[PDB]
Nucleic acid binder design. Structure first.
Ligand code: MG
Ligand code: MG
Ligand code: MG
Lengths: 94, 117, 197, 101, 127
RNA sequence: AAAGGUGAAAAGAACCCCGGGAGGGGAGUGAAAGAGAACCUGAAACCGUGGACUUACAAGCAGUCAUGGCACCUUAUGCGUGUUAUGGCGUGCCUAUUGAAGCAUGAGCCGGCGACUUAGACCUGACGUGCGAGCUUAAGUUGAAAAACGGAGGCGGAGC
RNA sequence: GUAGGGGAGCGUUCAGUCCGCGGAGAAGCCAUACCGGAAGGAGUGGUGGAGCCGACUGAAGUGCGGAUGCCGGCAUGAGU
């Protein structure tokens, strides 16, 4: 989301912002802000009673985008490259 | 010695020409217009990158008071309750709940109504 | 600080450039040598003047789309060269002291592996070439390395032609480029080598 | 055979600060050099003049070119260099040489 | 397969039922109009239509069709009663430029365009 | 003015077919004819033929972002690649200007050609190296598949 | 961030040196979803049919969208 997710998911391998804990395993725990993993509809802090476990899968770089900037008749043209650093995490959690 | 252009121009020209994929008429065929089109596209590319970030929040906000009103509330009111019940910090993906899980969305409407009244 | 091959075993002399050689100064020298050797024969009719073409055109105004005076200008196909190359030098007088320190520093680098002083080629006999091959083989000169022979003796010279091998240099007319160009230096004639001032 | 670098003519490096590259008038598009009107074009305008202070200032003068002497300090002879003899030929060999003066 | 060098000597590259009238002194545009009716039609209709299209491009085109027919039979041993205009097109030859004089001293350039009329016949085959 | 190029060798294509011819298809030659005499490569503008997805209630600087539909898997199945529908946004480029989408300038398009250089024993500054209270040589002479010699002279060294 | 000043580099030809490559296929051309912060640079396939990358240093006729720019080819107006 804004780094460090939440919600009832069914154990998927989603990609998020960099996590520091290199290679496989690493293991991460998330606060949780809402859930339906057991039909129980619980949200906020009462959701904090629970915590999702996720395993670090892969560290990566995003697809190459190009920063193009332009202003007319002021001779201004800017071309610079960009690639966004990420972390793939396999959800397991309670 | 004599350093002729040969290859340098054609390579640079073919590059720009290849950015112009499904551009209409001369824009995908002649270098001068192809390159010219791309300057304007540059303006559009940088803008729309931070503009899509306004677009989606708006789509999400729209799907929110669409559901909030379905249970006799509204966005202004529903989000105020979820703010008052501090515990709720959902904000992002509060529209997926509204769209896909009505039962679960009601729970949030009910919780907002309380923290408010 | 090095030994000889045939006809004696002295050497030991010469104060070598400190510390373990500066390539920077060797580079200063090589560039200069290469600049001096260069003959600036730049073929160009730069002048809108030098090229063969008349003097007036198609009137200043009227014509309806133009504005030109002559067919000789650089903006015209066939015309002159705006700033093309004309003949010149590139030759300059590199300070004397820097030329001295030059080959001294160059010798020094060969005096850390591939150096060799020789007193006469009794081993040769005639010109033969076949016999220089023999002589060199005995002294570890198989042909794997580029060798620079600097001898003041005319007959050992005549036994120097051959491939990725030997370049022959006369009457101590030694060159910083020539020594750096080859793997080994057969300094031979101990005339420039040892005893100076 | 393996890929080898090797020192020599191919390893004679620049000298870190030795020679920088010249100015080629195109650092992005936004180089249409000189100024932007009047002090651009051909070769003239000047950098001196004949009123921009000089004329407006005085003198008639009188220039001479009389006799100019080569200085020999006391400090040169004393301190160091024990009487190496001055004379007329041994004065030059020390380091206080010009001729014609 | 081998490599290109070999392929060039092994397989010798054929043009089945293809003919071409190169450098025809007519304008592509103009010539296309006639070719356009002949395309897709059975070599016999093609033959018959051409005899009645009142355009001077008809003669050139008709000739190519007969060359393509002859080639299909004599060279490729195809079946006459099965031949149809699989493909026909007019490509532009090199232009004969000419200088025409206009009023008040000015000149102009007439483009006497030329044509490359190619027609390719094939056997029908519904089944 | 502009214009160069088969092939290693002319072995320069006998013979057959359509055609008055031109031109072509075969046969043969050759490594190649994917070199055939409009003979090396053969870009781009520009003209066509074929296929995919598409288009006859639509207001259009011709893109961009978002999504859906179809289609294709040779840096290529998590992705993409091509195309398309609808929605949002969106005033060509250069120049010149206080102020340009401007109904101000320039330009039909593409290819190639095309604009800050060179000289000087010139001045002044940066950086670098060599020697250092000293530092250099010029013309020339001698060698030169190469550099040595040459202190005439030049600069620091005292100012008013 | 315009004039302008300063910095770091990409690319082209030529040269010297090193390392190589090539008719079991060089350059050039063509296609491409890969790489790099940019200029740019690779892999693969296709075409070509004899030359040529990479690195270090040196030198320049060294980078084009404009100049009613020059040369050439080809469009529009128009089957008028
Ligand atoms: Mg000329
Ligand atoms: Mg005006
Ligand atoms: Mg132009």
């Amino acid at each position: 989301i804004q780094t460090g997710g939440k919600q009832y998911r069914v154990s998927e391998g989603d990609v998020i912002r960099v996590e520091s804990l290199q290679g496989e395993a690493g293991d991460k725990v998330e606060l949780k802000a809402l859930f339906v993993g057991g039909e129980q509809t619980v949200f906020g802090e009462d959701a904090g009673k629970y915590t999702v476990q996720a395993e670090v899968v892969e560290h990566g770089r995003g697809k190459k985008i190009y920063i193009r900037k332009y202003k007319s008749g002021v001779q201004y043209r800017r071309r610079t490259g960009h690639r966004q650093n990420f972390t793939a995490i396999k959800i397991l959690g309670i | 010695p004599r350093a002729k252009t040969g290859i340098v121009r054609r390579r640079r020209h073919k590059k720009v020409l290849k950015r112009a994929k499904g551009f209409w008429g001369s824009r995908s065929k002649q270098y001068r217009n192809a390159f010219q089109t791309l300057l304007n596209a540059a303006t559009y590319e940088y803008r729309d990158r931070r503009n899509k970030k306004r677009d989606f929040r708006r789509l999400w906000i729209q799907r929110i008071n669409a559901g909030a009103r379905l249970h006799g509330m509204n966005y202004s009111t529903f989000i105020n309750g979820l703010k008052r019940a501090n515990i709720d910090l959902n904000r992002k993906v509060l529209a997926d709940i509204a769209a896909r899980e009505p039962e679960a969305f009601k729970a949030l409407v009910d919780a907002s109504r309380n923290a408010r009244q | 600080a090095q030994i000889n091959v045939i006809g004696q075993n002295g050497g030991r002399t010469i104060e070598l450039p400190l510390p373990e050689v500066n390539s920077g100064v060797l580079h200063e020298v090589v560039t200069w040598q290469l600049a001096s050797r260069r003959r600036g024969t730049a073929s160009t009719r730069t002048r809108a003047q030098v090229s063969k073409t008349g003097r007036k055109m198609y009137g200043q105004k009227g014509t309806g789309n133009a504005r030109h005076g002559d067919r000789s200008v650089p903006t015209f196909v066939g015309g002159g060269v705006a700033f093309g190359p004309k003949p010149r030098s590139y030759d300059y007088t590199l300070p004397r002291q820097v030329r001295q320190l030059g080959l001294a520093m160059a010798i020094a680098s060969r005096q850390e592996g591939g150096k060799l002083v020789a007193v006469d080629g009794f081993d040769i006999a005639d010109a033969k070439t076949k016999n220089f091959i023999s002589w060199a083989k005995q002294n570890g000169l198989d042909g794997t390395e580029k060798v620079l022979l600097v001898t003041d003796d005319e007959n050992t010279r005549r036994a120097a032609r051959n491939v990725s091998w030997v370049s022959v240099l006369p009457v101590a007319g030694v060159n910083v480029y020539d020594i750096l160009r080859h793997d080994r230096l057969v300094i031979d004639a101990a005339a420039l080598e040892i005893v100076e001032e | 055979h393996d890929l080898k670098p090797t020192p020599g003519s191919r390893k004679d490096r620049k000298r870190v600060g030795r020679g920088p590259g010249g100015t080629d008038k195109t650092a992005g598009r936004g180089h249409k050099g000189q100024k932007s009107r009047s002090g651009a074009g051909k070769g003239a305008f000047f950098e001196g003049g004949r009123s921009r202070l000089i004329a407006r200032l005085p003198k008639r003068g009188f220039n001479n070119v009389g006799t100019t002497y080569e200085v020999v300090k006391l400090s040169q002879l004393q301190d160091l260099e024990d009487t190496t003899f001055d004379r007329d030929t041994l004065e030059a060999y020390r380091l206080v040489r010009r001729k014609n003066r | 397969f081998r490599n290109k060098k070999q392929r060039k000597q092994q397989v010798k590259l054929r043009k089945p039922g293809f003919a071409v009238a190169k450098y025809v002194r007519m304008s592509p545009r103009k010539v296309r109009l006639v070719v356009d009716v002949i395309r897709g039609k059975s070599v016999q209709d093609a033959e018959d239509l051409l005899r009645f299209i009142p355009r001077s491009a008809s003669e050139p085109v008709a000739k190519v069709l007969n060359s393509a027919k002859a080639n299909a039979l004599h060279n490729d041993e195809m079946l006459e009663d099965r031949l149809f205009v699989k493909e026909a097109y007019v490509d532009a030859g090199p232009t004969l430029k000419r200088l025409i004089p206009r009023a008040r001293g000015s000149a102009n350039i007439i483009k006497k365009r030329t044509s490359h009329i190619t027609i390719i016949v094939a056997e029908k085959g519904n089944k």
